[model samples]
Each structure stands twice: as C-alpha cells, then as structure tokens.
Target: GVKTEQEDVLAKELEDVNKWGLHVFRIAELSGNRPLTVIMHTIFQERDLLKTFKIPVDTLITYLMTLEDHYHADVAYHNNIHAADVVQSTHVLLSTPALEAVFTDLEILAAIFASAIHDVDHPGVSNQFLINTNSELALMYNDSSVLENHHLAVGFKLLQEENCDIFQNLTKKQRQSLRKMVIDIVLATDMSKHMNLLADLKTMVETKKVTSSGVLLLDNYSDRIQVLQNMVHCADLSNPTKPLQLYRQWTDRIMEEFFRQGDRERERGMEISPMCDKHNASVEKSQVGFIDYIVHPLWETWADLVHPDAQDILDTLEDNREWYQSTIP
Candidate 1:
C-alpha cells in the first residue's frame, strides 16, 4: 500500500494544468482596464472567470503559486499540489443534482478558493495544540477556530493585492456575500467541526429536502452556509476516489509527510496527532487510521447526499480500507 508514492503523480498533474499559459498579475485584468497593448494581450489571453460557474483555472493556479511562496516550511506539506487536488475534488462533489442550481458563480468561486487555500502551511499540529499551548496562531485568533480562522484570514488577505485580486470584479454587495461565504466555508474545513458538519449533512440528506430540479436552493444564509460546509469537506477527503493505484500512492506520500511532521513534533517535545506518530505503524496502518478518523465520516455523509453517484467513491473507500487492513507491517 505504501509503494504508490503519490507526490510524483500529482506533480505531473499540476504541471499539466499550469501549461495553459495564463498570467494573473493584476486586478484590472478582469475588467479590461489596461491601456497597454501587452497588458490587454495578457488579460484577453486569460480565461474569463464569469463564463464558467467554477473558479477559473488561472485563478486557482495563481493562488497556489502564492501559497507555495508565502506558507511556512514544515507546514508547506499542505501546499499547492494538495490545494489542486482539493479544488479538483470540489468540482466532482458539486456534480450531484441536489446542489446543481443552488450554487451561484460567486459560491462556486468561494468553494474552489476555500479548497485550494484552506490549509496552506498547516503546522503538523492539531488545533488543540494552538489552544493548549497558546501557540502564535491561537494568540492571534484568540484561540477561537485556532487554525481555521487563521487560514481564512490568510487566504483573504492574499487576495487583497492588486495583481491577484480574485474578488476585484465583484460589486461591493457581491464582495460582502463572497467574503461571508468564503469565511464560513473555510472555517468549516476545520477538522474539529467534522462531527457536527457530517451530522448536519446527513440530516439534510435523510429529509430529501432537495429541489425537484436537483438544485441546491439557499433562500437564507443558514442553508447556504451548510451546503458549503459539506462541500469543502468532500474535497478534503477526496483521495479515496482516485484510481486504486493512485489512491495508494497518495496515502504513501501523505503518510510520509505526516510522519515527518510527527518526527519533528517529537523532536520539539510536542505531542503528535495519531498518524503522525510514525513509529511501529507501517504506511498501510497509517492510512487505516487516517480513514477511520478522517476519510470515512466525511465520505459517508457525502455518499448520503449523492447516493448512487458516490457509489464508486464509496467502493474505492472500502477498497482502500481493506487494503490497509489486510496489509502486513
């Protein structure tokens, strides 16, 4: 199970995506505000963010580049490539009928952005570390949402620059709504919110409250918030759906990353998260632990929402779980 070594594969995928040759270097690029011909040339060459419902690939790429440069070293394990996977996964999760119409362009953009930037440079520690030890992140956000709030604030602040201003095209009201949705969605990505988020999603799916046209309609703020909360969670746990070989590879890389973080934490005299402990456990068992604690709950709720649509994903998850269970150290 550990032999797959996914980082190599994901690197190829990101390289393929970046080959499209789009430059996201200015806010004015979105509105045709350039007087220079070369500037116009660059802006016009770039894909339009509005033509499609999802975040433009160019924007996602630019955002990833920013994270690669700005995020911390040890934490950079949650870098551009992982962000790409989550964004790709978010697109898949949004394919179900229940949320087809409920999402607007702004909502789609926010979800994509949230997925890409949610964990930029996550310290190999859990949120409890921030709270229990009064870490800098905890002190900055006053220990509330510890990591989640910090990610949202950092993600948004990065967008304030003129060159990478993804929200510069929005009207003031639209920007406000986008900001609200982005913050709520990103904050929901906190692992601490996992249980409650899934519980709420399951309740909604059980009620079959979906629209006749299979659109996710949010007549109020709460409904919108709930949908996005689960949307990013699906993206986070998406590794299970990949091809078996591919999935195993990702498990290998992530475990290596996790274990490395664990080793560092141990060196720093910090208590490590479960999988990061890196000792007697092999890569396969490490994956099993991650699935039991991280992947299954999130996927189970998502499977409920899409049912047959998610059957393959469920199969893969079970397949992955079994692979781990049957393996020898």
Candidate 2:
C-alpha cells in the first residue's frame, strides 16, 4: 500500500518531464533505478512515437528494462541515470523552436534511442584508460571509438532478444537509416572526435542560414546529421548548464568515477590521469577550466544557433561558472 503512494508521486513528478528542469535524480529514486525506462516511455507516449512506429508497449517496456539492466549499477557514473539524463537533454534540445519540424519522426526516434544507449555498460573509465590498459574491449574495437563501438554493439544486440525489438517492424530502408543515424550519433560521443565535430559545428554557425522566423535551414544530410550529432554531444556535456543543485549532483557522480579511475591507475602503477586524482585534485578549479574551455564555447555556438531557445541554458551556464569561480579560494 505504501508503494501505491510511491506510484502516485512518481506519476505526478513524471508530468514535469515535458518541461526543462525536471529532477532526474528524483525520478531515479521514485522509479527504483528505472529512470531510463520511465523517462523514455513517458517521452515516447508524449511524442506519440509508440503509435507512430508501431512499437508494442510490451516490447518497448522489455527493451527499455533490459537496457536499464545493462548499465553498471556499481559504477559511480555512466549508468542508467546518466543515460536517462542525456535522453531528457536531447529531448529538450529538440524542442527548440528554431528546429521545429526540422527532423522527421525517424530522426527523433533515432536520436533519442542513440542517447539512451550511448554509454550502456560503461565501465566508469575513459576510453584512453581502456587503450592504455590494452583491454579486450579496446582490442576488439581496434582502439578506434572503442567505447562507442561497444555501446552500439550492445544496444543493437539487445534488439535480437525476444520481446525487445522496438524497431522490428520498420521497413528495410527505415531500419537502415535508423541504424546509420544511431551509429553516427553515438560514434560522435567519443571525446577523441571532439575536435572535428566542434569545428564542423563552428563552421555551421559561421555560415548558418536561418529563416526569417529563426528557423535553421539544414538542407542536406550532412548538415542535418551534423546538427543531430552536436545535439547529443551537447546533451552529454550539459551538466553545467542545468540548475545548480542538479549540476552539482552530476559533478559529484563523475568526480567519484574519476577518483575510482585514479585509484585504479595508482594500483597499477600508471600515472593518474589529470583531474582523476581525488586527493590532490582541485575540484573547483577543474570545473572552472572545463566550463571556460569546453562547455561554454559549445553552448555559446549552440545558443546562437537556437537563438532565444537556449539563452536560458547559456545564462545558467554562466551562473554556474561564477559559482564555481567564487568557491575557488
């Protein structure tokens, strides 16, 4: 009977999923670590995607539940909660007026799907760590997009399971396009690919041609996919742009993971990666540097592309930076 109240409360908070600033941590607690499934299902229903794609509810549930299970619970970061966060961020990014009706349903489905599974089964360590350790995953992927390729493989492999094929009914062309989209979007998440992706995005903003009403005119697949790639990448990098409390929660999670990695490196007698060492780390300074160098510039360009849509995000980012800077003493 107590869980009945739990259910009611969960249902109430889930209504906020359609808006920005939804507390994903609350959803995680209420849903019993099923945040990814609950949030993904809510989004699918809200967007009419289940009906549009002819995906059975049971299939969607099974697929999502399995996907949730695949995320390592012991990992301090890069788990189902993070996946759900990215998915929600992608959804919010897609809601910008400048991009209204810009992408097809297939594109939306694929982007959301890619976001949900982009870091599945993550080991809470960086790809460079994997390559440095000569891990089997690195060897299998030949050290190129090792983590991304693994995420894609696991995400698609689950579709082969009974009662878990959300995209089963799509025609060959639809399936192929979805596959291509998922592959390209997830592969772009690799930080190693950060330069070209950010460069291409910068070039797009430089020559961006928008309609009179602030609509982005992405006229080709290259332009279109580039935008989608950046959307997911921004979602993955959006921790600092959220409300301060939530942003701090994500920082704590990722920092824990970083410390774990540093400990592992220490145990293995390898030099610890920068910012990974918890004992000697300057958390506030590192956050400031990350924001100043990586997060702000990307969001600045994105804010320009989305115009008024992402200005609040940009403002929040600035606010968060100032908060970190103030505490640097």
Candidate 3:
C-alpha cells in the first residue's frame, strides 16, 4: 500500500511541523490531505510524548489517521485541515517561553490532544441550526453545546477501537487528568461559552503574576486551567492569526459555509443569521466587522499575555483587516 516516492515527499513536509509559520497547504498536498495526522504525529514525536507515555507510535498514527478520516471533507469548513491548523497554532502558543514555563508536560499534552480532536466529525452546521432543525445531535445534547458535545464524544469513542487506544499505557490518575482536561478544553470551544471564556481570560491577564525572570507563575489550578482554556479557544479562532493568503482562504471557506447555511434557513423559512445570507452580507464588510468586534479584542488580550511572541500575529491580523476594508466599496 506504500509507494517509495510519495513517502519521501511526505517526509520532507513533516520536517517543519513545529515551525510557527508552517505552510499547512503544502503539508496537505504532500501527505495526500492527511495534514491532521501528519501534524499530530510530528508533534508527538518531536515532544517525545509517545515514548514518554510508552504509547505504541504505530498504533498512535493508526488512530490519528482514523480520526482524520472522520472529519467530513465535503464540509466547506470545520474540516481536517482546519483542525490541523488549530493544532499547529496551539503548538506555537505553547512554545511561547513565558507561558511555556507555567504548564506541566501533562497539561501540554492535553492542550495539543484537545486541539487535534476538538472539531472532529463536525456536521458543517452551527449549534443553533441543529437546534432549529430538530437534528439528532441537538436533541441528544438537549440543545446545549450540541456540536462541541458531539465532537468530544466521537473523539473519545475512536479510542474505543483496540488499535486506537493511544492513551491506554498511561497510569490511572494520568489518564483521568488527561481526559478531564481534554474534555474541558474541547467543550470550551463552543461559541456559547465564548463570552464567559474571554471574560475569564481578561481577568487572568489583569491579575497575572510573573517572576523576576519574566516567566508566568501559576499558583492555583483554576488560574492554570483558565489560561489553557483560553489558549485552546484562541487557537480555534486563529484563522486571522494565519498569514495573509491563508487568512483570506479561510474567510472564503467560512463564508461559503455560512452562505450554504443561509440557503438551508431560507428553504426552511427560518430567519437568516447575520453574515449567513450571501446576497445581503458583504463579505468584505463582514470581515471588517468581525475583526473589529470579535477577533481584535480577543487577539489584543492574547498578544498582551504572550507579548512579543504574538505581536507579529496581531500585526498580520491588522493588515488583513485593512486589506478587507480596502476592498469594500
């Protein structure tokens, strides 16, 4: 089933998986669109996590490939590449020296693992759409955090397969903690929790304590978990932090997905969500509003916490916002 030529191409892309500005598009092409598997596999190997936990590396790759397949490629957004992008962003964030000092290795593993599986098997629709349509996931979750709940469930369910149980070698306590932390981080990705999550992040930033050496110091579990939650949340919203071309590409994909949802809403005679109606919503103007009202506030706080590490990201975001604004009218 393996070709030598293709294998060499794949190996080249894996070399830069840890680079902050890794070009995931190339990785997707080289890996035959197995970007998530490549990214996660590279991260685990780079961190020596698989060896540390005594996980079978081959088994882990099998699990990740299976997990990658569960992501619906037909979905215009919330696909495997997006998940890979978020995981890469989470990796870059964790690499921040100031913040790196605060997290334990277990916490680092939880953050990256949660990112890899955060949006698994997304239905290419929002929670509100699922609720309004009386969809099974909505009904099953009782209309609360429906998709996020489903993602968490399906991701863990994959581990039920004998070959996919990557965490089986961990001690009982380690497994419990990893599961709890991953669950918390994934559930926090729901938009319904966005406001509360950002509020907690802002409070943490304001009260953050640092050592004389400029390292972050967390004295309590709540503070540590809050930061990690924000890290995951920020990565989930990190499309704009990406370089200009990739940022624009993500915007196009998300807009197409929104427009598709609008079509469904119209067919069902339901009120259209803002930015969902393609005819009425100006994509350029919407991008501007999104950056001004939603993305900027969050990234500003994130850049503040990470300081110089994320300053360039904020700069790119600002530049992208201007580019969008310039295209309007």
Best-matching candidate per TM-score: 2
TM-score sort, best first: 2, 3, 1
Total clashing residue pairs per candidate?
Answer: 2, 0, 0
Models 1 onward score TM values of 0.76, 0.98, 0.96
Per-residue lDDT of candidate 3, residues 1-329 (tens digit):
76588778778767767665678877888888899998898888888899888889878988999899999999877999999999988988898877756788899999999998999998788999999999989999999999988998999999987689998899999999999999899999987787888888888789878887777878887888888888989888888777887887888899988999999999889999889998898988988898898788988988887776788889988998988899998
Query: lDDT of each structure?
Result: 0.63, 0.94, 0.87
lDDT of 1 by residue, 216-283 (tens): 44677776778787878877767765666657656666777778767867887987866677675576
What residue pairs clash in candidate 1, if any at all?
A: 6-249, 102-216
* Candidate 3 positional error at 15, Å: 3.4
Clashes of 3: 0
Q: State which candidate, 1 or 3, has the greater TM-score.
A: 3
Query: Which parts of model 3 are misplaced by more than 4 Å?
Result: 1-3
lDDT of 2 by residue, 191-280 (tens): 888879989999998999987777899989999999999999999999999999999999999999999999999999999998999889
